[PDB]
Every structure is written in structure tokens, then in C-alpha cells.
Design an enzyme around this catalytic site. Structure first.
Site, PDB file in Angstrom:
ATOM      1  N   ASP A 159     -16.855 -48.452  -2.708  1.00 42.22           N
ATOM      2  CA  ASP A 159     -15.898 -48.466  -3.820  1.00 42.22           C
ATOM      3  C   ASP A 159     -15.486 -49.893  -4.136  1.00 42.22           C
ATOM      4  O   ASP A 159     -14.297 -50.240  -4.146  1.00 42.22           O
ATOM      5  CB  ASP A 159     -14.667 -47.601  -3.542  1.00 42.22           C
ATOM      6  N   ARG A 163      -9.455 -53.940  -7.448  1.00 41.10           N
ATOM      7  CA  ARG A 163      -8.310 -53.579  -6.622  1.00 41.10           C
ATOM      8  C   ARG A 163      -8.624 -53.598  -5.127  1.00 41.10           C
ATOM      9  O   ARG A 163      -7.676 -53.571  -4.322  1.00 41.10           O
ATOM     10  CB  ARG A 163      -7.709 -52.237  -7.061  1.00 41.10           C
ATOM     11  N   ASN A 164      -9.903 -53.637  -4.729  1.00 43.48           N
ATOM     12  CA  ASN A 164     -10.292 -53.738  -3.328  1.00 43.48           C
ATOM     13  C   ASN A 164     -10.708 -55.147  -2.947  1.00 43.48           C
ATOM     14  O   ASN A 164     -11.338 -55.353  -1.895  1.00 43.48           O
ATOM     15  CB  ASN A 164     -11.386 -52.726  -2.992  1.00 43.48           C
ATOM     16  N   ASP A 177     -11.173 -53.119   2.786  1.00 33.79           N
ATOM     17  CA  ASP A 177     -11.535 -51.695   2.857  1.00 33.79           C
ATOM     18  C   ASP A 177     -13.012 -51.390   2.729  1.00 33.79           C
ATOM     19  O   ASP A 177     -13.394 -50.459   2.064  1.00 33.79           O
ATOM     20  CB  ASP A 177     -10.692 -50.914   1.848  1.00 33.79           C
TER      21      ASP A 177
HETATM   22  C1  LIG Z   1       0.747 -60.888   3.640  1.00 31.12           C
HETATM   23  O1  LIG Z   1      -0.072 -62.009   3.342  1.00 31.12           O
HETATM   24  C2  LIG Z   1       1.312 -60.401   2.278  1.00 31.12           C
HETATM   25  N1  LIG Z   1       0.584 -59.541   1.569  1.00 31.12           N
HETATM   26  C3  LIG Z   1       1.018 -59.090   0.283  1.00 31.12           C
HETATM   27  N2  LIG Z   1       0.282 -58.134  -0.507  1.00 31.12           N
HETATM   28  C4  LIG Z   1      -0.861 -57.443  -0.059  1.00 31.12           C
HETATM   29  O2  LIG Z   1      -1.396 -56.614  -0.802  1.00 31.12           O
HETATM   30  N3  LIG Z   1      -1.375 -57.776   1.235  1.00 31.12           N
HETATM   31  C5  LIG Z   1      -2.452 -57.146   1.892  1.00 31.12           C
HETATM   32  C6  LIG Z   1      -2.749 -55.682   1.618  1.00 31.12           C
HETATM   33  C7  LIG Z   1      -3.722 -55.097   2.258  1.00 31.12           C
HETATM   34  O3  LIG Z   1      -4.031 -53.692   1.978  1.00 31.12           O
HETATM   35  C8  LIG Z   1      -3.294 -52.831   1.013  1.00 31.12           C
HETATM   36  C9  LIG Z   1      -3.363 -51.366   1.397  1.00 31.12           C
HETATM   37  C10 LIG Z   1      -3.662 -52.929  -0.478  1.00 31.12           C
HETATM   38  C11 LIG Z   1      -2.720 -53.019  -1.410  1.00 31.12           C
HETATM   39 CL1  LIG Z   1      -1.035 -52.993  -0.998  1.00 31.12          CL
HETATM   40  C12 LIG Z   1      -3.018 -53.155  -2.872  1.00 31.12           C
HETATM   41  N4  LIG Z   1      -4.294 -53.168  -3.272  1.00 31.12           N
HETATM   42  C13 LIG Z   1      -5.352 -53.055  -2.288  1.00 31.12           C
HETATM   43  C14 LIG Z   1      -5.075 -52.934  -0.977  1.00 31.12           C
HETATM   44 CL2  LIG Z   1      -6.416 -52.789   0.107  1.00 31.12          CL
HETATM   45  C15 LIG Z   1      -4.473 -55.911   3.283  1.00 31.12           C
HETATM   46  C16 LIG Z   1      -5.651 -55.364   4.109  1.00 31.12           C
HETATM   47  N5  LIG Z   1      -6.524 -55.020   4.740  1.00 31.12           N
HETATM   48  C17 LIG Z   1      -4.167 -57.238   3.530  1.00 31.12           C
HETATM   49  N6  LIG Z   1      -3.101 -57.831   2.790  1.00 31.12           N
HETATM   50  C18 LIG Z   1       2.232 -59.502  -0.224  1.00 31.12           C
HETATM   51  O4  LIG Z   1       2.556 -58.959  -1.489  1.00 31.12           O
HETATM   52  C19 LIG Z   1       3.640 -59.531  -2.228  1.00 31.12           C
HETATM   53  C20 LIG Z   1       3.892 -58.559  -3.443  1.00 31.12           C
HETATM   54  N7  LIG Z   1       3.369 -59.083  -4.552  1.00 31.12           N
HETATM   55  C21 LIG Z   1       2.074 -59.156  -4.504  1.00 31.12           C
HETATM   56  C22 LIG Z   1       1.554 -60.039  -5.648  1.00 31.12           C
HETATM   57  O5  LIG Z   1       2.032 -59.608  -6.902  1.00 31.12           O
HETATM   58  C23 LIG Z   1       3.395 -59.262  -6.866  1.00 31.12           C
HETATM   59  C24 LIG Z   1       3.753 -58.433  -5.633  1.00 31.12           C
HETATM   60  C25 LIG Z   1       3.085 -60.457   0.523  1.00 31.12           C
HETATM   61  C26 LIG Z   1       2.665 -60.904   1.706  1.00 31.12           C
HETATM   62  C27 LIG Z   1       3.488 -61.890   2.558  1.00 31.12           C
HETATM   63  N8  LIG Z   1       4.592 -62.469   1.798  1.00 31.12           N
HETATM   64  C28 LIG Z   1       4.401 -63.653   1.085  1.00 31.12           C
HETATM   65  C29 LIG Z   1       5.687 -64.144   0.395  1.00 31.12           C
HETATM   66  N9  LIG Z   1       6.807 -63.765   1.003  1.00 31.12           N
HETATM   67  C30 LIG Z   1       7.802 -64.316   0.443  1.00 31.12           C
HETATM   68  C31 LIG Z   1       6.995 -62.430   1.010  1.00 31.12           C
HETATM   69  C32 LIG Z   1       5.816 -61.839   1.800  1.00 31.12           C
HETATM   70  O6  LIG Z   1       5.956 -60.813   2.434  1.00 31.12           O
END
Ligand SMILES: *C(=O)c1nc(NC(=O)Nc2cc(O[C@H](C)c3c(Cl)cncc3Cl)c(C#N)cn2)c(OCCN2CCOCC2)cc1CN1CCN(C)CC1=O
Length: 299
Positions: A159, A163-164, A177
Site C-alpha cells: 500500500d 500517507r505511508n 508500514d
Molecule cells: C516524533 O518525531 C513526532 N512525530 C509526529 N508525527 C508522526 O506522524 N510521527 C510518526 C508516525 C508514525 O506512524 C503513524 C501511525 C502515522 C500517522 Cl500518525 C499518520 N500517517 C501515517 C502514519 Cl504511518 C511513525 C511510524 N512508524 C513514526 N513517526 C509528530 O506530529 C506532529 C503533528 N503534526 C504533524 C505535522 O503536521 C501537523 C501535525 C511530532 C513528533 C515529535 N514532536 C515534534 C515537535 N514537538 C514540539 C512536538 C512533538 O511531539
């Protein structure tokens, strides 16, 4: 589960934080880890922790264990989400992975679309959005490099989609993933996600019609991802519902060239969508083709 000392990490060195998201069989939360590098045992880092949901079945557990084992065997590459450790002893199962601070590539692009002509000019860069062509090409090249690595380890994604792909603080693309159980013999092709995605729109025809997956099926998906990049996070097959998609694919329909996309890149998209899987480029060929564009435009 037995103790694997190569990977086991003490769960008391994790401080769980805000949830990130959830998938078919698990949920992912941010966490602080202390001493992930054993030579710096008190140093903090931010990681992503996958674990089972509260309603988890035995199948969910087997799926998470399978993902952990794939991630152990994959090895390290810059352009994939890498395994950092696991917690299997005396508590819930945790799979600890790199965290990508800018989220997924679709979200990254949609948040960075250029200013519209409704905005009043303010300063000397009012027309300049965050995204430039060479950086878009670099995103595509880095995804191709990560997929080439995964292919070399005999891993099929099944997939692959913007988004992945996850984006680090340094704009490094990391495929996420990969190699997961995705229930390929029981896909609801009409399923729409909570954000409106129709995953069927990324499936190669041999996968959709014949349930056959190869690295060349991932190449088809990569072509869809290229279209997503060059539309700055657009949704594929605009306006086309699933019933119409089936009939259009049987007729050989392909997406149009998007606005502000050079013919080099639309040409690569169309090669990735050739009907015969052997007539699509390999990931090695896509890496080379995208590197030539990237080098030409980075001079
Ligand atoms: C840690 O670096 C981190 N990560 C994120 N976002 C994020 O998605 N990290 C991530 C997700 C992930 O798998 C999930 C299931 C996923 C998601 Cl949620 C969405 N699409 C696909 C997938 Cl596959 C994996 C794996 N394996 C690894 N990492 C994060 O966010 C911030 C929210 N933000 C994102 C960007 O646009 C606006 C919203 C934040 C952080 C760490 N940080 C950084 C900054 N600080 C201040 C806050 C914080 O927690």
C-alpha cells in the site's frame, strides 16, 4: 515471547506521550526514550511506540509480532522507518521505531501549498511558497531509494502511498508500514477512511483484479505517489468513485498530466502505469531517472 537481547529495551526507560494514530491492528504513540544509545544511558530521544489496542484479538497480536520480526530482519536504511528496540518482557508488547516529526508526506505537502492570489502582497517573497521543484524531485528520489532498499531485502509494501511516507525534521523521506499484514484476501474495495482516502486507488491492476503482488505492483503505486507529489498532495482519480474506477481501469484509463508538472515526470508516471508489469521501470531505474533530473535542477 522469549527475550531477544539484541533488540530488547527496558520499558521503564520509556515515557509514553501523546498518541499519533492507529491502524488496523495497533496504535502508535510518541514517547521519550532514555539511553537508546547505550553509550549515553541518560540521553533523551523521541521515538514512536506501536502497541496493541485495548480490544486486541489474538490475530492482532500475531500481526504485531509479525511486523516486529519483519522490522528486525529489514536492516537500517536512511529512507525507511527503522526499528530501534522492542519491549517483550513483563508487560505489554511494544515495537519502538523512529519518529518522523513532520508527519506523513501527504499532510506535509497539503500544508505547504503556495499562497493563493487572494493574499495581499507583504514583503519581497509573497509569491514564494515553501515548496520548490527540486525539493519535490528530491522527495520522489528518496522514496524510490527507500523502495529500492526494501526490494533488495525482498520486502513488498502493498500500500505504497504518500500517507505511508513520513517526513523527518530534516525533510528526509522514510517509508513506513512496509511488510505488514494487510488482509489482502479480504479487502473491502469500497472502504473510505476517516480522512476520505480510497486505498483501492493505489492498487496495481494485477493486485486489484488478480490478487497478485510483486515489486512491480509497488512500482505502479509509486507512480500514483508521484502524481500525489506533483499535485502537492492531491487525491488520485479526482471525482471518480470506486464503481467507476473499476470500469475505467478495465478500459485502460489513466490520470491526466497535472498542472505545473513537467513532461519528464508525467512520462515517469505513465511508465509506472504500463499495463504489463515487466514494462514498468524497476526501482533501480526510477532511482537513476530521478537522480538525473535532481542533479540537473540542483546545479
Ligand atoms: C516524533 O518525531 C513526532 N512525530 C509526529 N508525527 C508522526 O506522524 N510521527 C510518526 C508516525 C508514525 O506512524 C503513524 C501511525 C502515522 C500517522 Cl500518525 C499518520 N500517517 C501515517 C502514519 Cl504511518 C511513525 C511510524 N512508524 C513514526 N513517526 C509528530 O506530529 C506532529 C503533528 N503534526 C504533524 C505535522 O503536521 C501537523 C501535525 C511530532 C513528533 C515529535 N514532536 C515534534 C515537535 N514537538 C514540539 C512536538 C512533538 O511531539
Amino acid at each position: 515471547l522469549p527475550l531477544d537481547p539484541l533488540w530488547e529495551f527496558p520499558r521503564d526507560r520509556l515515557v509514553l506521550g501523546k498518541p499519533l494514530g492507529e491502524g488496523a491492528f495497533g496504535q502508535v504513540v510518541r514517547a521519550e526514550a532514555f539511553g537508546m544509545d547505550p553509550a549515553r544511558p541518560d540521553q533523551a530521544s523521541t521515538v514512536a511506540v506501536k502497541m496493541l489496542k485495548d480490544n486486541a484479538s489474538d490475530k492482532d497480536l500475531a500481526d504485531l509480532v509479525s511486523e516486529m520480526e519483519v522490522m528486525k530482519l529489514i536492516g537500517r536504511h536512511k529512507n525507511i522507518i527503522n526499528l530501534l528496540g522492542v519491549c517483550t518482557q513483563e508487560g505489554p508488547l511494544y515495537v519502538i521505531m523512529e519518529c518522523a516529526a513532520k508527519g506523513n508526506l501527504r499532510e506535509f505537502l497539503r500544508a505547504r501549498r503556495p499562497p493563493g492570489p487572494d493574499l495581499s502582497p507583504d514583503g519581497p517573497r509573497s509569491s514564494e511558497g515553501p515548496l520548490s521543484f527540486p525539493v519535490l524531485v528530491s522527495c520522489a528520489y528518496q522514496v524510490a531509494r527507500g523502495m529500492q532498499y526494501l526490494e533488495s531485502r525482498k520486502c513488498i509494501h502493498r500500500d505504497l502511498a504518500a500517507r505511508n511516507v513520513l517526513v523527518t525534521e530534516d525533510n528526509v523521506m522514510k517509508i513506513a508500514d512496509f511488510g505488514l499484514a494487510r488482509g489482502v484476501h479480504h479487502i473491502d474495495y469500497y472502504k473510505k477512511t476517516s480522512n476520505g482516502r480510497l486505498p483501492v486507488k493505489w492498487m496495481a491492476p494485477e493486485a486489484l483484479f488478480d490478487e497478485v503482488y510483486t515489486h512491480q505492483s509497488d512500482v505502479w503505486s509509486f507512480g500514483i505517489l508521484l502524481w500525489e507529489i506533483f499535485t502537492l498532495g492531491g487525491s488520485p482519480y479526482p471525482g471518480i468513485p470506486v464503481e467507476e474506477l473499476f470500469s475505467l481501469l478495465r478500459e485502460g484509463h489513466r490520470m491526466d498530466r497535472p498542472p505545473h508538472c513537467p513532461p519528464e515526470l508525467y512520462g515517469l508516471m505513465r511508465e509506472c502505469w504500463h499495463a504489463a508489469p515487466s514494462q514498468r521501470p524497476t526501482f533501480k531505474q526510477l532511482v537513476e531517472a530521478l537522480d538525473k533530473v535532481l542533479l540537473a535542477v540542483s546545479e
